[PDB]
């Protein structure tokens, strides 16, 4: 309602759902508002699959970066001439190019998996589909749409054998249950096939007693990220803590909440509908799985009720600067010239400058 | 009708047409469907001019790559400070930048020329116009839209002389007939003026008894192509042969048929209009001059009735992978893990894997 | 009216206006016509502030390049960890990234400042807003849209003190008057903070007795410009002089008139609304502050009534070529093959070629 920047579950539709897991696909941002039209090629998926199961083979006509949000997983990318599976624990990023086959298995015996992917449609600005080689309960094989003669010619065989072996609809859809022994071989064995990145790998950018913010960037370091102009981020906010009023200089963040709960403040600037320019606040209640859009140069503050884990997909990331409006470091206001503050602000300069030296910590403080 | 991916002649309008040749311009893809909205800046032209004739001088506000589809030709690019004509035989690519003057002459005495260009509009997303310095039967000179004073001032002369020499409407339009002797001097003499590429130059990517596929890529090799993110391709399919079910990982191909005829299978994935996802086939009859769009990650199979020559302009080409769904090499299904196939497909793993080792050739086989 | 390419003052709305200056923002080009849809992310601002005043602190969610059009100025960019002010005299370009704080002061005692900026919206294709940390008569502080608790928590203080010092609405809006002494310290002290470029720095590209054209390009030289694919230009046309019929091979120029007045000829190519292709002229009267769009491959001629200063922001600038249709140098017509002219033009080749050697100067001549 009030908030076009906040998307919870009811905005999440369900493409596929059985007792072994489910796959949610978030609606095209360019509907609710043109406030972020420039995000329209970025569609969000969230996946959840029970222990010892598997998301079946397919590919999309959409670029993809994939990230382990809860639990444990063994993912496989596949090529025309190459396969290459990896095991990914949480806060691990993997990139599945377009047209490349891939499947995900929940390595874990007792605990779950809750994978979150961004998708990037190639053909149609807002749209991507899946292509399954295998038919099943919930979808159809893309080889069924071929001819009797071609299939036979292609595969060197009669229609009956191809059909009986490959085409027939068997499984209860796109996520099926797996043996324990079968798993030991899929794991056993764990190009444009990039290696999996760890989003927490180095020393975190922002860090103190109340919070942490890891961030991988479009760099000479990571060649892939540089190619997409896209940064990946992870924020962790302690219970009772406050991520202070801040913003991103230029990146447009699609944030999605891993776990926990907390308190969103987003502040926009609104032409109605010498025209009055309005500072309208927007707030929202954050819960496991929620999503909030965080446009460029727009201030936000976030307070954690619970131990709060956030994931952040950044667009237009190159040379981004997360600027802060309070604290010792990354304080942008502090940097303003002293006569600059004196004239702008109601108070004197030295007084206004004194209130800035008042808050002596940096990025995260105690909420209250 | 049924097929939005298939464009034949009736989709081709005619911008210019006389007894010495004609120029066809294919309608904006973003009309029929938003299924390939992202192709809207790519407009197709096809040109046909008799022996010993010439397409007259002009430029467009549209980038351009040009390719000899049938016959023989001598093409001239021109600059503010430089001219540079080349002779191009078939399967030769030439790039005419934006704002650069150019004309084409049919070098050949008895045989024709059937040039195919892609155009890339600079100003308006879907639209480009021609600018002719000379007036004629079918169009007007862009200097006529200047003033009496300016022209005179610019050119150092009275209006009468400028008009009599340059402006007056003379020719039967934009393609005129040429002398034999005149030709010997235009040929005699055969910057941002790039040299002409040969699309068949090296050793072909795919090759056997039934087919060939040459392809030039956006590479450290070809600097221009790298700049456009655009690959050029040529496929040759023998009579009776089958280009197996395949697709492009990420590139969006605008294919155009040089010569011959054959059998198009295109397989899409269709949301109508937990929603049913439909494998809808699309087919089409291919004839000299036809065009079919070949979106990313979408399977196609093509069988040649006649000796079939195809041209392919690729978009989003960088690190493309043409993936194949049948054959020894570039077989993507083969690469799937063995337990992966067993669970997905109706058959067992070893059985499903046996049907793959059945077809022992690679990319092209005998259709029937 | 008649001209969609010509935008004068009445097209310029007023975002902010007091006795100490004013800020004009030109309407989104994608309204009047889709003739330049591809310019829709480029919005024009023009600023005018009296001697000894200041445009107050803010940032936008829009990239920005800024240029001194008349007078003298001291500009400050600011960061989360860095400030860096420069003094800029006319024809000086400065780049203010997105999310970065900045303010402008009129250094001069008796003379004015008339700054012209291009803005580039990050979030919404055509739209950018300002974000002021300080509240005032004409706008509101973006910290007012925060909460009682957060502000207090963030800043380490009660609501009263924060409000009294920082939040309260004090000034007569966004441009205020400054002391003489205050100025001596702001000037006294005169990252992603780029140094200021001089657009007249080297030896001018085009130059003679009647005109000058300076131009900075997207180069290995200027790294920033290369990043934006954007060239900056300055043209100076003598009273009575003529900038000859010319055009840009590929760049789309947003031109804005610094000072003087003169005579615009723009020549388009018009499908109505084997279709008739029309050379329609467009003209316009140019006055201090006017703006005219100059699409790619489109001819223009400009004659100066008065000493005429033009500013030019180029889009799609990489490897642009300004091509000329008259004069010794950059004459594109001259470059056409001799048999090429003979057939195209009404006259013979040698005659048509003689009228080209007639005008012996290059780029600027005497209008009449
Ligand atoms: Cl963030
Ligand atoms: Cl192809
Ligand atoms: Cl210009």
UniProtKB/Swiss-Prot annotation, chains A, B, C:
Glycans are attached at residue 303. Residues 5-163, 197-353 form the Cupin type-1 domain. Keywords: Allergen, Glycoprotein, Signal. Induction: Repressed by water stress. It comes from the Eukaryota. GO terms for molecular function: IgE binding. Residues 187-204 are annotated as: Disordered. Belongs to the 7S seed storage protein family. This is Allergen Ara h 1, clone P41B. It comes from Arachis hypogaea. The chain holds residues 171 to 586 of 626 of the full protein.
